[PDB]
């Protein structure tokens with residue numbers, strides 16, 4: 001078996017290899033990339049997402065979210081407090097203010113230490129889940145707005161026609177903005193492009209050991225776990241690398257920089273944080289190999305997780321037994 005230690009693999013496709021998205025994802029999996037739960041893809045030097053970012057200030061972040069932490073430094077939950085709308089221009093100025101700017105640091109390792117030591121004592125503001133794309137319509141390769149849809153994949157594999165669409169989202173980050181431990185909805189894949197700005201650090205647990213993470217999480221968040229069998233679906237729990245090592249949870253870390261793609265694989269739990277002002281674009285996708293994961297994916301039916309319109313049909317087709325109970329949590 002390829003990649004038996006489940007290391008995060010980094011790929012450098014040629015412009016010729018960057019032409020066919022599906023084929024390249026299959027190639028990465030033939031090399032064992034999926035075993036890590038996350039891969040990095042460096043685009044060919046010839047490729048560009050768009051010509052410039054000079055005109056992005058006017059995007060509206062309708063609902064900025066302040067991420068407020070409770071708990072201890074290495075084991076905490078965060079909730080999202082809604083703030084008033086601001087433009088990307090205003091957000092970028094806020095990110096760079098003294099209150100919110102990245103602190104002086106020697107290197108990524110020093111910044112990681114400061115994140116985990118001080119994250120809980122501050123509340124950064126995240127512009128998350130904004131529908132839209134920054135890929136130029138004439139960018140033809142790995143354009144996250146022009147991938148084959150999940151609904152077409154499900155139709156090709158299973159012969160059923162369903163409603164729904166699947167479009168990209170933009171994320172505007174600042175120092176300490178955090179993504180909690182999670183898999184994708186229905187354990188889909190994700191692809192994330194860091195368009196501009198400061199890096200994003202990622203932690204990931206190999207899919208083959210996801211249940212060990214979930215067991216630790218049940219122990220670390222005992223109330224949350226009582227309230228919902230799939231409470232990691234709430235996307236609120238953080239667990240530091242130090243705590244993961246103490247508990248023998250296998251994981252890996254890697255830092256994404258601007259111009260780089262990350263791909264998360266089905267049932268790869270991931271979490272991370274942003275180093276400073278940045279903008280990422282992401283979307284979920286499927287391949288034939290996802291279908292079995294989608295069929296076995298855990299679901300939140302407590303009401304907290306509350307997901308897109310498109311997810312209904314995935315549950316309806318792939319998890320018909322779970323559909324009634326799950327939809328009762330959506331209504």
Ligand SMILES: O=C(O)CNC(=O)C(=O)O
Pocket residue numbers: 171178179190191192264270280282283
């Ligand atoms: O960029 C972020 O904040 C979160 N991204 C992801 O969880 C992803 O692309 O799968």
Ligand SMILES: [Mg+2]
Pocket residue numbers: 055056057058059
């Ligand atoms: Mg603009």
Ligand code: NI
Pocket residue numbers: 182183184190264270
């Ligand atoms: Ni994700």
Ligand SMILES: [Zn+2]
Pocket residue numbers: 227228229230231233234300301302303304305
């Ligand atoms: Zn729940």
